[PDB]
């Protein structure tokens, strides 16, 4: 639930460290925590809201020019200043121009023109600052057990039903204890200020759209920029460079508007997150967090029941999921008080031995309605196997088959792992529990070597990264044998970051 079809999957084996399992969350994906001490809990990030933003600079997408005038003082005579040079708000450019004879005055060598034009912006684009304070998060979480598979995605109740809970996390409170009624409460601790890498991202608005921008982009761009602190009337900086006052060899100096740029900023922004809003608070969607999940108090609600009688008949027939798990709907007609539901993935028929992990924890259909549904899911072994439900002679079974095995399941897990290293780095070591040396130094040797790679290289991507990447791999084949050790590796370092896709 809040899982299955999402297709970006992370399973995090239990943690014998006392519910100290630490997990990363990405707005794309979700991680399911399976712990024998617990019912399997499904965590997913949803929306990271930002509120109480402030304005920083701004720009002019579309220039507009008003009144063009000029004067010239003839040869010997500075550039006669128009009145329009005293009001600011007017572009002015003083150039040298021939006024010969019948241009009205002797000395046919070179005079001076001063042309000026009122400059009034049209539309605008206003950056906004995002600070780690007044930053929020929203984590919805749910628990597999027994529940109408039709409820897999819903929000009506976020504060009720089986156990779903909507957890908020904001700076001044890294922790929230989510109480899922009857399952106890999942201790949850998250570092809001760390993960998302803010303070480097200005929040940016073109006309009725939004983005995010690394600073040292939005701080340096060549357009007219309002000072941003006062909205009364624009007193611009710049004000050239969206207006080109040019002239050929004659008596004229002309001036051009440039026809906004609004198409440029778009085509300029690349690799920039697009963020929607709804008034004063903007909801990004790109997930990052480091959450240490405390599994301490979780009370299985499916213990101390009988086994639900015979009357189990699948619905929607089973299906395969993504990483290979299987889901099942079962409608137990037999009605009693909430009754535990036997399910076993069996590698045979006669004597049914448990084969393969059953991860719903303990499915328990809670209704008196005499007709109920429970969606339990389980991952059977690679070879052909049966899914079995029930204990009585009326039990019903289904045959199901898994594709790959062993080395098969390793590669697919070895790719996604490296995918994390690609998208995260650093914190990507935070799945593993406790303090393990290999995990301790894992973030250790990575953060140092990483930042250096986040400075030396780190110029650009796509055809930029691959080139400087590919050329290094050449040095490995050639050159001595002392440097071709590091270089021929560094290529892979780059190429992999280009192979994310």
């Amino acid at each position: 639930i809040r899982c299955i079809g999402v297709s970006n999957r992370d399973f995090v084996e239990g943690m014998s460290g006392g519910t100290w399992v630490d997990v990363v969350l990405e707005h794309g994906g979700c991680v399911t925590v399976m712990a024998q001490d617990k019912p399997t809990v499904d965590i997913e990030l949803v929306t990271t809201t930002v509120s109480n933003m402030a304005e920083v600079r701004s720009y002019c997408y579309e220039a507009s020019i008003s009144d063009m005038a000029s004067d010239s003082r003839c040869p010997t005579q500075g550039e006669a200043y128009l009145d329009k040079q005293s009001d600011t708000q007017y572009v002015c450019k003083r150039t040298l121009v021939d006024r010969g004879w019948g241009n009205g005055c002797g000395l046919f060598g070179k005079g001076s023109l001063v042309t000026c034009a009122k400059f009034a912006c049209s539309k605008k684009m206003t950056g906004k600052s995002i600070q780690p304070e007044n930053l929020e998060y929203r984590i919805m979480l749910s628990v597999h057990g027994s529940q109408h598979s039709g409820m897999i995605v819903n929000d009506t109740g976020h504060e009720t039903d089986e156990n779903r809970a909507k957890v908020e996390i904001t700076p001044n409170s890294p922790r929230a204890e989510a109480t899922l009624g009857g399952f106890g409460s999942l201790g949850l601790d998250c570092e809001p200020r760390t993960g998302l890498d803010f303070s480097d991202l200005y929040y940016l608005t073109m006309n009725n759209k939004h983005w995010l921008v690394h600073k040292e982009w939005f701080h340096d761009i060549p357009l007219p920029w309002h000072a941003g602190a006062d909205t009364g009337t624009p007193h611009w900086n710049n004000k050239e460079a969206l207006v080109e006052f040019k002239d050929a060899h004659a008596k004229r100096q002309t001036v051009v508007v440039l026809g906004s740029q609004e198409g440029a900023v778009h085509t300029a922004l690349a690799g920039a997150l697009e963020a929607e809003m709804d008034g004063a608070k903007g909801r990004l969607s790109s997930g990052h967090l480091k959450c240490r999940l405390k599994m301490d108090k979780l009370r299985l609600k499916g213990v101390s029941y009988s086994l639900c009688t015979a009357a189990f008949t699948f619905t929607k027939i089973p299906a395969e999921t993504l990483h290979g798990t299987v889901t099942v709907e079962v409608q137990y007609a037999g009605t009693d008080g909430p009754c535990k539901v036997p399910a076993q993935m069996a590698v045979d028929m006669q004597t049914l031995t448990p084969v393969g992990r059953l991860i719903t924890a303990n499915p328990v259909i809670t209704e008196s309605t005499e007709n109920s549904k429970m969606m339990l899911e389980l991952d059977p072994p690679f070879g052909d196997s049966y899914i079995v439900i029930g204990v009585g002679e009326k039990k019903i079974t289904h045959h199901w088959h898994r594709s790959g095995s062993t080395i098969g399941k390793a590669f697919e897990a070895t790719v996604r792992g490296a995918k994390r290293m690609a998208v995260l780095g650093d914190t990507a070591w935070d799945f593993g529990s406790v303090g393990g040396a290999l995990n301790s130094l894992g973030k250790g040797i990575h953060q140092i070597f990483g930042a250096a790679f986040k400075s030396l290289f780190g110029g650009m991507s796509w055809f930029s990264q691959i080139l400087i990447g590919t050329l290094l791999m050449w040095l490995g084949l050639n050159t001595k044998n002392g440097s071709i050790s590091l270089m021929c590796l560094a290529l892979g370092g780059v190429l992999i970051f280009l192979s994310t896709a």
């Binding site: 970006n8 995010l212 690349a270 690799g271 920039a272």
Partner: protein, 75 residues
């Protein structure tokens, strides 16, 4: 003017697809594949710059790629 530097330099990296993912793959290549089709020339003389620079095989090839690559661009 132009400048309007490309935000791709610092590329915000997360799971959600970035602003233009699709066009960002061929946008650096397509520019070159045009400018050559307009001018065959800078290629034709490139080798001359090549063969007179570095004068060894591959070491003399990397130029003929670096040149024809620096050729179509304000850089």
């Amino acid at each position: 003017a132009v400048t309007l530097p490309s935000h791709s330099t610092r590329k915000l990296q997360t799971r959600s697809q970035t602003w233009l993912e699709s066009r960002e793959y061929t946008k650096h290549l397509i520019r070159v594949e045009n400018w050559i089709f307009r001018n065959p020339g800078f290629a034709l003389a490139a080798a001359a710059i090549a063969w007179l620079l570095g004068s060894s095989t591959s070491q003399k090839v990397i130029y003929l790629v670096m040149i024809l690559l620096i050729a179509p661009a304000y850089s």
